[PDB]
Structure formats: structure tokens, C-alpha cells
Design a protein around this ligand. Structure first.
Ligand SMILES: O=C(O)CCC(=O)C(=O)O
Ligand SMILES: [Fe+3]
Length: 343
């Protein structure tokens, strides 16, 4: 067994980059925007027909790969060319993002999800939906917070929406800007190798997954090669987590083993995309001061970090009891089965 300790790195070629750009432009002209119901309905057809063949092959292989050798993450280096001057300054927060300017990127990202094959979705739990594509920008008003809008503190490794029974299957993180040279942290359940006594206790549905309350298993799926639902900040380093002495102990014993396996080697460049199997690989990023980097004992001022996130589900059927009646891509789940009580 070759235990995976790092993600697969794919160096995108100039020809691939040029195909993606032309195909992105074409889809913008044809459908207006990536949330067009006609485009979403024929997504997989557009993905398999319009993407560079090597991208399609990589993502198809990845979608059904849950083997011992599979890390659960891919870095697509130089997927897109970002013209920094055209992009202009980073808005003060995600609310200031110009999705008219990010439209082509949303098309490109949705094609990658559609080749898994997987369908982009939105969550009421995340910005009351906020669309299929989210701009992740450091907000000065939320500098030391444990969110995507944060900066000043370490964003602990977590799988996305550990508190939801219908959390994303796949995630894409498109880096438009990372001039602060913030490392992206990744953690795979596969980095542990063979099933062990510490891991086995996590299959027990005795754990709190904060958004008494309902409990769930941290490990699920196959007993030998499991899937993971984990949030270190929310489940372990939270005074209000409400874990039992037994569960907290198990989580702590697990965190001790897991923290040595966290990979912080990759520093994304502008135009890089990280593609994640949200059932295998947790993500985070180190602390940073937005709009600056330190080099040879001097402060270098720069444009603020800007990343685009897209989430997807492989089945609209399984999630149908938690989606909107008139939108099967809009997840209304609040906490482990419970739906948001709105009206
Ligand atoms: O900034 C990052 O790379 C990760 C932020 C994050 O946790 C997210 O978009 O879910
Ligand atoms: Fe996240």
C-alpha cells in the first residue's frame, strides 16, 4: 500500500487553458449565465463535450475513486489566466463581488463538477443560498473569525458543512489572487492508511456536529476505507460543542493522530484550482494579514486574497426531501436532517 500524503498535482497546459477560455466565452454568449436552467439541465453534456479530454478523464476517474491510494484532492495548476488589472481591486467583503465579471469562471467551474459527474448546488445554511458560485474574500470586520471571510487566525481543517446530512460531495476552490502566499491546508482520511483502533471509535453515532441536539458518526461508508465528516474547530475546540466525555476523548485521540498528517505544502497561485472529494479530504488555510506578505524582514503590500467556491451533489434524488419544491438544487437542510423553519 502506497498511503497518499499529498494531493495529485496536474499542470494545465497552454492549449488546455486556451480551450477552457474559448469554451467559457462561448457558454457566456450561448446561455448568459451559469445559473441558466437550460445550461444546468444539459450540464454533463456540456462538460464531456466542451472540456479538454485530459481534464474529463482525470475528473471521471476521481469521481468514483474511493480506494486506499486516493487522497481525495487534485490541484489543477494554472487552470485559468487571471488578468489582475481587469479583475481590479478585491471588494471589502464577499457582498461587493461582481459576479458579472466572474460569470466565465462560474461556467468553467461548473463544467469541472459536471465531468465528475456531479451537479452544482446551493445551501440555505451558506449565505441563504448565495448562488452556485461564492466569492471567498477576507472581510476586515471578520479578521479573527473561523470562516471563509476570515484571515488573522488559522482556519482549522474541516470537511464542508459537517453539521448537514446532505453536505457537498465535491468542492472546487478557484484562486484568483493569493499574493499574501497563504498555504492551503489539506487533510485526507486516507493518509491514516489501514483502519486502526483510534479510527474505529469514530463510526459510533455518538458525536455532536454543531451548526439537546442530534449526534452523528465522524466515519461512515465502507468500514475499511471510510468517508469522513469532520470539523476540528466546531467539534473539538469549541466550549459549547456539548460532547460527552467519551466522544470528546475519541475526537481528541483522533485529532492527535490526524494533525501529523495535515499537508500545508501547497501555496496556490493565481489561476490554480483545488478540486476536493468532501467525503475524503478536509481543507483549511493558515493565518495571514489580508493585503500583505513579509519578505527578507520587510512588509510587502499587495491586493487582497480572492477565491471562488463551488459545491456539488452527485444525486438530486437522495437530497429531494431537503430541497425546495421548485428548485431541486437548493438545499434547505439546517442540521442533521432538520430543515430550516422559515414561514
Ligand atoms: O480560503 C480557503 O482556501 C478556504 C475557505 C473555506 O473554508 C471555504 O471556502 O469553504
Ligand atoms: Fe470550508
Amino acid at each position: 500500500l502506497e498511503i497518499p500524503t499529498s494531493p495529485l498535482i496536474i499542470k494545465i497546459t497552454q492549449q488546455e487553458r486556451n480551450i477552457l477560455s474559448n469554451v467559457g466565452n462561448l457558454l457566456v454568449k450561448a446561455f448568459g449565465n451559469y445559473e441558466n436552467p437550460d445550461y444546468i439541465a444539459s450540464l454533463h453534456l456540456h462538460a464531456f463535450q466542451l472540456l479538454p479530454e485530459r481534464i474529463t478523464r482525470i475528473l471521471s476517474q476521481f469521481g468514483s475513486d474511493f480506494s486506499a491510494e486516493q487522497y481525495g484532492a487534485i490541484v489543477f495548476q494554472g487552470l485559468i489566466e487571471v488578468d489582475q488589472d481587469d479583475l481590479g481591486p478585491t471588494p471589502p467583503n464577499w457582498q461587493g463581488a461582481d459576479y458579472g465579471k466572474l460569470n466565465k469562471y462560474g461556467f468553467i467551474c461548473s463544467l469541472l463538477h459536471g465531468a465528475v459527474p456531479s451537479k452544482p448546488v446551493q445551501y440555505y445554511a451558506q449565505r441563504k443560498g448565495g448562488g452556485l458560485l461564492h466569492a471567498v474574500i477576507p472581510d476586515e470586520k471578520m479578521a479573527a473569525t473561523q470562516t471563509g471571510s476570515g484571515s488573522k487566525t488559522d482556519l482549522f481543517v474541516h470537511t464542508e458543512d459537517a453539521f448537514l446530512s446532505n453536505q457537498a460531495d465535491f468542492l472546487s476552490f478557484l484562486y484568483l489572487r493569493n499574493e499574501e502566499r497563504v498555504p492551503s491546508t489539506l487533510y485526507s482520511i486516507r493518509s491514516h492508511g489501514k483502519m486502526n483502533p483510534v479510527m474505529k471509535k469514530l463510526f459510533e453515532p455518538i458525536y455532536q456536529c454543531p451548526k439537546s441536539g442530534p449526534t452523528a458518526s465522524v466515519l461512515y461508508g465502507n468500514r475499511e476505507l471510510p468517508f469522513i465528516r469532520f470539523d476540528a474547530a466546531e467539534q473539538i475546540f469549541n466550549e459549547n460543542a456539548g460532547q460527552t466525555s467519551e466522544a470528546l476523548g475519541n475526537l481528541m485521540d483522533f485529532w492527535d493522530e490526524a494533525k501529523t498528517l495535515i499537508n500545508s505544502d501547497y501555496i496556490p497561485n493565481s489561476g490554480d484550482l483545488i478540486f476536493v472529494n468532501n467525503h475524503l479530504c478536509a481543507h483549511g488555510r493558515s493565518a495571514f494579514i489580508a493585503g500583505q506578505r513579509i519578505e527578507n524582514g520587510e512588509i510587502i503590500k499587495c491586493e487582497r486574497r480572492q477565491m471562488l467556491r463551488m459545491m456539488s451533489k452527485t444525486s438530486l434524488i437522495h437530497i429531494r426531501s431537503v430541497t425546495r419544491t421548485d428548485d431541486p438544487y437548493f438545499i434547505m437542510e439546517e442540521h442533521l436532517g432538520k430543515i430550516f423553519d422559515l414561514d
